[PDB]
Amino acid sequence: PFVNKQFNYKDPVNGVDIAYIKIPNAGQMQPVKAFKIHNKIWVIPERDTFTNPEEGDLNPPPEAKQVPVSYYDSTYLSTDNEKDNYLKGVTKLFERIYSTDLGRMLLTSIVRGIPFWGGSTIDTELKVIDTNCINVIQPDGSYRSEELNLVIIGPSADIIQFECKSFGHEVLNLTRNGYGSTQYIRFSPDFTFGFEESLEVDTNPLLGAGKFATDPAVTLAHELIHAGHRLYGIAINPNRVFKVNTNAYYEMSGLEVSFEELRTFGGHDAKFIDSLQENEFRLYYYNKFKDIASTLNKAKSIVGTTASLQYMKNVFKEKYLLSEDTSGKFSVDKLKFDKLYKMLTEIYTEDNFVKFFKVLNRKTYLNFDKAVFKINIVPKVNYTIYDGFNLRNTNLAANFNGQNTEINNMNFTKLKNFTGLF
């Protein structure tokens, strides 16, 4: 299993994989109880009022001031039972993802994607960037710095606004300069979204109530794909967007969708990024990897005593799949770069995960959400690592009957309809 411990939220802290921690939000905060479910990966069963100090209010603004696709509930994830269920739900989803060859590949890439040690101001020394760490309270009450790659945390005010968040740098654009940074994914396994089986209905903002439910493992995988891009510092600048001209409803509102999202979904959506611009990005990141190779060559000493210089050099030699010559100099091989870049951007896509999970899912990112449902994937009678909602040897096994909210209505509670609100 990906997670070797079936944690309970109430398990006593041990200062190792169950501990109170603080994140580098450049601000103050009370320690929060977190769980390390795998090497380099932690889960914080709390609403995210930490990564952004300006987003500490969970209370919903006045009803006359709320947008379209959003859902508020300041009480969600405030009790121990909810946190226990959150932890178990997120864990089950990691196992579902890991059970597929593609998920195993993606998770392996994420674990190997340690954020680059580029915090030193002296190019002859390698130093870790402290915002890619968390401070863990040890048994003696002292804090120890631990590097990590991924943190799954509860959503902020808008419960359904799932997304990757990471701490930036004063000058370096960590998610776009090949370096990478610790990723905090705002996510919840307790809600899911409804979509429509007919393409003409799903991509229309005036039709459909959301008959089918998105499998939450796909939603998490989508975020993990973004995390992968960001951990390897190859995320596409959000200012690079596709001025949608394939959907009259998007067009009439001048809606734009970032290339990063189209790339992440994959399938035909990825084709909206023309060859010229795609080549531009590839060359850009190829160069970024070259800088990392050179920075490693200029490194003559390492800061800290946790790991040795040769160890960290090998860590990044493996992450970026660099080549080493006779003198021990590092360099980027075009074939290996192209292979890794392609793996992270074309192999790991939402569309491909749908093929592995054998579930029904939106056919394109360019659609309109229909509704949000409350769910509970923790009980095996509701959802399993192997079949998600479509339980084998039951009436829900075929035709995605488990995702059919009308047939499997006992597993879904519609909280809000979005159709017509655009």
Binding site: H222, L255, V257, E261, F368, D369, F422
Partner: peptide
């Protein structure tokens, strides 16, 4: 991010 999920999107529209």
């Amino acid at each position: 991010r999920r999107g529209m």
